[PDB]
Amino acid sequence: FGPICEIDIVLNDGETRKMAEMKTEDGKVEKHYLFYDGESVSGKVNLAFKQPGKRLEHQGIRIEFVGQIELFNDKSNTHEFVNLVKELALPGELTQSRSYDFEFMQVEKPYESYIGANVRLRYFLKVTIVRRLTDLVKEYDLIVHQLATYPDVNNSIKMEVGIEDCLHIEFEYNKSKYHLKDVIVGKIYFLLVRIKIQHMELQLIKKEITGIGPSTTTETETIAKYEIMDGAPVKGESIPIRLFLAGYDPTPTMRDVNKKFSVRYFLNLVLVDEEDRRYFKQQEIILWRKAPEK
Amino acid sequence: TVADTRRLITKPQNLNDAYGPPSNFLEIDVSNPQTVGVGRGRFTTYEIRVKTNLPIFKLKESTVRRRYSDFEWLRSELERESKVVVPPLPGKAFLRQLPFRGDDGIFDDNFIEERKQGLEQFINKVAGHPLAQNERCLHMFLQDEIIDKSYTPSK
C-alpha cells in the first residue's frame, strides 16, 4: 500500500530565501531555511493524495509554528517557548489532493537555534491531520539566527597572574566580546621566569551548561589548541597573539536561554614546562553573531 | 588594505634581561654509587650533586651522599604536607635482598645503574616542581649533609 497521504510544506519565498547549516551528531550537516526574530512565516501545505479510489476521514487539519528546547533527548523534558496555530480544515474527508494557505504574522523568535550535547533548540512547522487513532504529522525545520550590533562597552582584558616567585606574566586580549569571524589580537608579557617553559598555547573552550540550580551538567569541548610560543622566554619578553576565530566556526554565547541552558566560551592560556607540568588561566569571552550591513 | 597585520604594541626588552643568563637554571646529577659497611649492614649510597641559580636554594652548588631510603623519606614527606602528585621511585626491590640468587642481589650492576637513572629521573621532577621547592624536606634532602628525620615540616 504505502501512505494514503503525504504532507509537504512550501514557503512563499522558497526561491529567494537564504538557507543556513547545522552541525548535528556524527559530523552530519543539515540545511534548513533561515529566519529572524520578527519575520512572518507563510506558505502552502500541499497534501499529495496517493491512493486513488480511497478516502481519508479526519477530525481536522492544522499547522503549528513551534519553537522549543529539548533536554537530554528526553521527550518528557521538551519545553515549548513559542506556539502558534492555524486551523486549515474542519473535520471531514479528503478524496483528492489539496493545498492550504497559511501565514503567521510577524513571528517572535527570541532565541537562536542550537544543537548541543544535552540541549537542542529548534524551530519548525508541524502539520497535523487528526485521525481517529493515529495522527498524520509532518515536521518542517527552520534555522533562526539572533543578531546583534557592535557593543556599547568593550574593554580589553588585561591581567597579571602567576605562581609566586616562579612565574609572573601579564596577558592582554584586545576585547571581551568578539564576533564569530573576529580575531583575538593579544600579547603575553613575561615579568619573572624561574621555570623552564617548553611551549605555550591559547585554547578556545566551549562549555554547555544544562539544568536548574543544584541540577547542573556542564559539557566541555576544547574547540581550538593554538600554539603561540615555542621555547623558553626570559623576563621582559613579549609574545604576540593573532588567533582568527573564523577557522573554528563556533556558536554565539547564549546565557540562561529560557532559564534552561547556557553556552559560554573561554580563552584558556596554557604554558607547559620541560617535565610536562601545565600552568593555565581561563578567561571567559562573549561571542556574538554580527549583523552584516544588509 | 589586503592583510590584517594587527598586533598590540610591545615594550622593548631591557638588554640585561635579553642577553644575561636565564633565571631557571637547575640540574641535579645522581652519580657515583658506593657500598657503605660490611656484611649484613651493607647498603649503597649515591652522590646528589646540585647546580642552580634559583634564590630559594640556599647554596648555588652542593654535593651530598644519599641512600635509597632517604629518597623514600623525601617522597613520603612530600606526600603528606605538599599536596603535590609526587612521581614514582624506581622501586624497592625486596626479593633482591634474599640470599643465593643468580645475581649479586642488591649490588647487581644492571640493577644499580637502572635504579640510579630512576632516582635522577625522580629528583629532577620533584626539584623542578614549584610547590615542592617551598617545602623544607626538599632542601634538607639536597643540601644538608645529613637528614634530620625528627623535624617539624615547615613552608
Binding site: 597579571e160 606574566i169 601545565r278 | -
Partner: peptide
C-alpha cells in the same frame, strides 16, 4: 596524569 596548576592573580 599531567599536573594542572591554576595561575593566581597578584
Amino acid at each position: 596524569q599531567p599536573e594542572l596548576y591554576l595561575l593566581n592573580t597578584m
